[PDB]
Amino acid sequence: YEIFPFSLASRLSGISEKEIFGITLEAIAESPEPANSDRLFSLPGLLVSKLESNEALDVLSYA
Amino acid sequence: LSDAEKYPLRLRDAIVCAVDPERAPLSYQWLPNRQNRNEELPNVGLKGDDIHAFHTCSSRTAEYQSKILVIDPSGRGKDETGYAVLYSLNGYIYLMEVGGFRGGYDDATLEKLAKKAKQWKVQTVVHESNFGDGMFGKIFSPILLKH
């Protein structure tokens, strides 16, 4: 289920999705609270926009 | 033959009746007999499972104690969402609707479920929860309230 429609917001605002994920990651890096398990198992799906494929294959082989 | 323990559940051991939506008798008595047996309803049960009505019951009737709708939402992939409608009175439990709808969290399925919650004048909605999903109640509640 899609709680927040990235494509529609991307089209209306004029911001690409790759920058929306950056806006989320910078706010994660500054926050004082500890993370919980559901947050931790959903971070690779956001970080995957940064990686080259030869790096993502290493991440998969590690996982 | 393992016939006495192979299947725990038999249709012989329940009462079938055309109950009234507002009042019901306060007690019943069970005896399967040729006078009480049904013969027209379709029967998928294994051989010898015969649908029977009650034999005798009280003449005193009153309104039911509690009324529940139960939902099993669809998981991953395609399957039907299950639901059931039950009331209770004293030791007896009454079953009045069971069925399913096919789909996901689309507006048609949730609209139909809200209308079904309206139709029987139910009192509480109950559903199962797993894995810390946390979605279905928050999704469903703003759609239910207008009905």
Method of elucidation: cryo-EM
Residue type, A16: S
Q: Which of residues 10-39 of A touch B (CB under 8 A)?
A: 38
CA distance B110 to B4: 42
| CB-CB under 8 Å, B139 with A1 | yes
Helix (H) / strand (E) containing B144: helix B136-144
Q: Would you call B135 and A38 a contact, using CB atoms and an 8 Å cutoff?
A: no
CB A28 within 8 A of CB A40: no
Q: CB neighbours of B100 closer than 8 A, spacing ≥ 6?
A: B80, B81, B82, B83
For residue B51, what are the β-bridge partners? none
Residues of A within 8 A of B135 (CB-CB) are 1
Burial of B136 (0-12, 13-18, 19+ CB in 10 A): middle
B139–A38: do the CB atoms touch at under 8 Å?
no
Torsion angle of the four alpha carbons B58, B62, B64, B65, in this order, in degrees rounded to the nearest 10: -100
A38 → closest Cβ in B104, B105, B132: B132
Binding residue positions of B for Mg(2+): 72, 128
Count CB neighbours of A51 within 10 A.
Answer: 13
B11 token code pair: 């249709």
Give the pair of three-digit tokens for residue A27.
């706010």
Contacts of A1 in chain B (CB under 8 A): 104-105, 135, 139
